[PDB]
Enzyme design. Structure first.
Site, short mmCIF file in Angstrom:
data_model
loop_
_atom_site.label_atom_id
_atom_site.label_comp_id
_atom_site.label_asym_id
_atom_site.label_seq_id
_atom_site.Cartn_x
_atom_site.Cartn_y
_atom_site.Cartn_z
N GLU A 1 -20.62 23.85 68.18
CA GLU A 1 -20.05 24.03 69.46
C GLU A 1 -19.50 22.99 70.09
OE1 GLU A 1 -22.81 25.92 68.35
OE2 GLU A 1 -21.77 27.81 68.46
N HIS B 1 -31.22 34.42 74.01
CA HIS B 1 -29.79 35.02 73.89
C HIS B 1 -29.56 35.87 75.01
CE1 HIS B 1 -30.71 33.47 69.81
NE2 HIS B 1 -29.42 34.00 69.46
#
Ligand SMILES: [Cl-]
Ligand SMILES: [Cl-]
Ligand SMILES: [K+]
Ligand SMILES: [K+]
Ligand SMILES: [K+]
Ligand SMILES: [K+]
Lengths: 332, 329, 329, 332
Positions: free
Chosen positions: B59, B128
């Site tokens: 990322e 999440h």
């Protein structure tokens, strides 16, 4: 009559097996290419792998039934790893991995019941349904981590505690080939090497020279379909770290079935009979059914424990719900 | 005709790609038929490896790559698989993208879009499920939008791609498959929603209710329950988190004299905390017949168990409750 | 006797290290005589490589390392050189540390302290001046403290090291060399400040002024200017950002009927936005003779030029201005 | 009389020099070990390095005087790098580095005046005093980045634009040995290699096998004290990327003075005289004094432009100051 042990049996007690040689990175001498299996260990490994296998197939059934929600990562086909690894280490050693953790939760000592019941999100799950598939903890097992790559510096830090505590424990830090490009992994390699941390970095390669990516850190490439190969590599790697030489990388290749390989080995060398192994299968199936029944019958945890366990070792306090009139008690 | 939120975003990117060769898309699985949440489906087939670019799971790296390409004059759409994962890359978003035009004295613009689902989903647990609206909205140099329906998402994604600065588009994974009737004006490749403007989704006289993203529909459902009792809610779809449309909010409160804010994210230092603070600082404070109140997610990491999760996000009933408390009814 | 804020933190770590062998310190240059901002000076000489540990420039990595060591039962002090740099490691702070005790159902505690200077310094520009109080304070599972003076910093660092959960201690680089008279009770190795409790630094009747970190002293200077005109400010030192001491704030506003919040960080979704929202939601709203107002940093990336920088942080004059506006004088 | 060029001089026009051979990583053939210097280029490089040198010494003076605030990272001693690098690339190529950027701002085309005036925080700085030492931009120069390691993925992304735009430009992405353990650097190596990006990753090693850390990416180790060595390595590296072979690493070693080395080369081969070079020195000193006078006399930028340039291409708007009554106009 008492003149012969009640446990006396008909079989060989042990047999010597050839295991695949490991490719080496910066090591002169790798693990041995033969190993001894005892009947007792073989039966143990066979039962453990078979339990993981049936547990994961069961989880998949429940998942397709929508009884498990969210994620449900399975390790079926990979049982030589969690079991092989468990077999090369002590209970006082430490292990962390990412989210494909059901097998390790089992080999590290949680029951199938606690594991399935957490998956189905019930109060009898090992985290009372707070965590679900990805976040399960156990004794010297540190998850069960959902952010890919994040567990590797965690692992290195557990290894720093091993070194700090002075009890010769080691840490096995697992990651999948998908995470092998995370930059925080290379940060951890570098600090682990610099500090000589007893960290076995393990890449679970499912099917790219991963065991060499530690560069200065030595590596071995291992057959992750062969429980005996995994066991010996692990023993070698753990003994390497325990000697104070610092970290090491192990790439476990997986893709032939690991249970079948052990089964054939045990039957052909007469460590066990087809019939003994079938009876284990039968008992394993019963264990998985009892666990699945309990996981599906068990109630959800009660709403009033929603806010429990935010902080450890604190007085109780109140947390706010969806409006200021909804208040949840939080108790450590 | 009906179009899902997912399909609306996909229309918007397709059109913006077709319209400008400097637009490209990059992120994990964006080129694969299935394919994150299938939002980019079909794009790779139409535009190829050059323009639809699969990244490794890196990322910080691929977000930095996207930012440098914007610096060099290209127009990246950088997809975070979820915003939870944007935390690994957050220094690139804030220090390399947001702050750069300012620090450079107007010399270096950064035409980058960060997009992907934000907040709660279904059963994916604490790592999440995090909402990043307040976090991003706090930052000078960013624009931050949060679409609710199909129109919101097509028009904001198109405005975002056309903006010449870092725009964070916080989508919603539960909203993707939700179909909405799509007016002809939204069907057009010309369709834009100006960033910085709220939408009044339902006109009302008794209470101002302000929300963003998916809870907006919960706000509209609460309103329908409420009118059967002679309570008319004015429902406001923020659309933009920064710069938020506070004048639209104030105008409404000066008419209705009451305010509930509704959001999915955590309550403390969250979106409603800012709206509340602004109400109290501006011209609408004197028009309040009752203090303003906040509906939010519960102040916990998101639990897995379904019952717990259901009670960790605002429900239509929690909204109605809050509203009645404010109107004292 | 006078002790600098820097020396107070150093006393606190020295004592906590001596008192428990599981406490260790790690971060960039913590073992070097000069030595970040010299806060750890002398520690390495006393405690050696095992306990005072220099790291490479690898924030995500060494913060993850610190978190795993806490999971394994050790008690790390993880120093960020500035909090700006914590952004590279922020997923470790939030997803690995904050959320873990909860997700594990109370099985896995995380006794880690993240500490280091936060917010504005002098001339270090936009990438090195960011305040993270609202960002961290937003997160369930964290505790977040923000000391102003020498007493605050010794007592909170000691409480933080003794806590068994992730505590973010946001220090202040301008405050390090500021000397304060140190009472005998602060000199003691037994000295603790409970996390979650504000301090009334100055008693007052006309206005409640609430701040954290360095602006607290600006709040006390504004108060002294103000009493010469018969305006008595009650000055409140928050100390803890999460869980903040709102009852202390409410009690004060119910007495004074007016409120100004003062912070260094950006205004939108910032610390004062939460305090304002809570005032409006709780029992003190009915005691307001005037809406509450916020003093903050300017809503820009921090500029370099001194004049610009001076006008990007709240000054004593900005505080006085805000207060007079609220009291209408 | 006109029969001989007015510019006709007494010296050699060019000379051939031996430059140190580069250590190679995964390259069969490195840069040449001789190079030709023209009188014109030598005088150019000599003036440029000498200007960087005097600019940085001047900056240090102003800094000690507290006229420069915050950071002030200097590259004195490293002039063979920024000048050497500039000499091996085109103006249409791209360069990014971290905070030790004063030299590159100069070699990429900003005047000493704009550079010092930004340092002293005045309206005549290249960013009107908004950025100070660490954040200066110029033509195809992307800072001037204060977060160590952050510029390397930026660089790789500029290189992706080079490849995307099709004009055969390359990007030089510099980082210091201090940052060589940043995980986002290894993320960038991997994506650069995967996509064959024209990215020259450059480690400025001040005084640990850095040129090999790209593993699969080839490397060269270069003498960063020798402008000619840096120039040839750069030419080789740029031509490597321009051919479509993908990224490459260059480690520039610095610590003998680079200006003196060039000076001796120019005098001994009679490319220039001691006197010519002294007169350059004299002119350089004047340029630095004019720049320092302007940097210290120039006013601060006006308070009313505090909020300018938050967003590009937007209508004007208002930003809030320390209270809601303080409003700053923001104009793109
Ligand atoms: Cl079964
Ligand atoms: Cl000079
Ligand atoms: K754009
Ligand atoms: K969906
Ligand atoms: K602690
Ligand atoms: K200081």
């Amino acid at each position: 009559s008492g003149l012969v042990p009640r446990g006396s049996h008909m079989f060989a007690n042990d047999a010597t097996f050839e295991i695949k040689k490991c490719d080496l990175h910066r090591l002169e001498e790798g693990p041995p290419v033969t190993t001894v299996l005892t009947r007792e260990d073989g039966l143990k490994y066979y039962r453990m792998m078979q339990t993981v296998r049936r547990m994961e197939l069961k989880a998949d059934q429940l998942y397709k039934q929508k009884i498990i929600r969210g994620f449900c990562h399975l390790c079926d086909g990979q049982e030589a790893c969690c079991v092989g690894l468990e077999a090369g280490i002590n209970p006082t050693d430490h292990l962390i991995t990412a989210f494909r953790a059901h097998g390790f939760t089992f080999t590290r000592g949680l029951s199938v019941r606690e594991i399935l019941a957490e998956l189905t999100g019930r109060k009898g799950g090992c985290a009372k349904g707070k965590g679900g598939s990805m976040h399960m903890y156990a004794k010297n097992f540190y998850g069960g981590n959902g952010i890919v790559g994040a567990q590797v510096p965690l692992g290195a830090g557990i290894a720093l505690a091993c070194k700090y505590n002075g009890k010769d424990e080691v840490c096995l830090t697992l990651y999948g080939d998908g995470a092998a490009n995370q930059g925080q992994i290379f940060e951890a390699y570098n600090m682990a090497a610099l500090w000589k941390l007893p960290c076995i970095f393990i890449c679970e390669n499912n099917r790219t020279d991963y065991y060499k990516r530690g560069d200065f850190i030595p590596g071995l490439r291992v057959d992750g379909m062969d429980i005996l190969c995994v066991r010996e590599a692990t023993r070698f790697a753990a003994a390497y770290c325990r000697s104070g030489k610092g970290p090491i990388l192990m790439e476990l290749q997986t893709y032939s079935d690991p249970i079948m390989l052990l089964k054939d080995r045990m039957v052909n060398s007469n460590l066990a009979s087809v019939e003994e192994l079938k009876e284990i299968d039968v008992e394993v199936r019963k264990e998985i059914e009892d666990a699945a029944q309990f996981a599906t019958a068990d109630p959800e945890p009660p709403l009033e424990e929603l806010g429990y366990h935010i902080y450890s070792s604190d007085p109780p306090f109140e947390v706010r719900g969806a409006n200021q009139w909804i208040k949840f008690k939080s108790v450590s | 005709l009906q179009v899902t939120v997912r399909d609306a975003i996909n229309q918007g990117m397709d059109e913006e790609l077709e319209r400008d060769e400097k637009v490209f898309l990059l992120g994990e699985e964006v080129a694969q038929y299935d394919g994150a949440y299938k939002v980019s489906r079909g794009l790779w087939k139409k535009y190829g490896d050059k323009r639809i670019i699969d990244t490794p799971i890196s990322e910080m790296g691929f977000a930095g790559i996207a930012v440098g390409a914007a610096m060099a004059g290209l127009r990246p759409i950088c997809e975070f698989m979820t915003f939870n994962f944007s935390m690994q890359a957050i220094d690139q978003v804030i220090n390399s993208a947001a702050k750069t035009y300012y620090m450079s004295g107007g010399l270096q613009p950064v035409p980058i879009v960060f997009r992907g689902p934000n907040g709660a989903s279904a059963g994916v647990a604490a790592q999440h499920s995090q909402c990043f609206a307040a976090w991003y909205g706090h930052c000078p140099g960013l624009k931050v939008v949060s679409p609710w329906n199909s129109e919101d998402a097509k028009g904001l994604i198109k405005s975002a791609i056309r903006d010449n600065n870092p725009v964070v588009v916080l989508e919603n994974e539960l909203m993707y498959g939700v179909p909405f009737e799509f007016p002809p004006e939204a069907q057009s490749k010309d369709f834009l929603i100006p960033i910085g403007k709220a939408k009044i989704e339902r006109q009302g006289t008794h209470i101002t209710v302000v929300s963003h993203s998916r809870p907006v529909g919960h706000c509209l459902e609460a309103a329908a329950v409420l009118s059967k009792e002679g309570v008319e809610c004015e429902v406001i779809n923020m659309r933009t988190i920064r710069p938020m449309d506070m004048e639209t909010i104030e105008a409404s409160v000066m008419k209705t004299n009451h305010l509930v804010t509704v959001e999915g994210g955590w309550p403390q230092f969250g979106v409603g905390a800012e709206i509340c603070a602004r109400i109290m600082e501006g011209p609408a404070f004197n028009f309040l017949d009752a203090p303003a109140v906040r509906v939010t997610g519960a102040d916990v990491p998101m639990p897995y168990a379904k019952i717990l999760e259901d009670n960790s996000i605002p429900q239509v009933k929690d909204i109605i409750f809050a509203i009645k408390k404010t109107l004292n009814i």
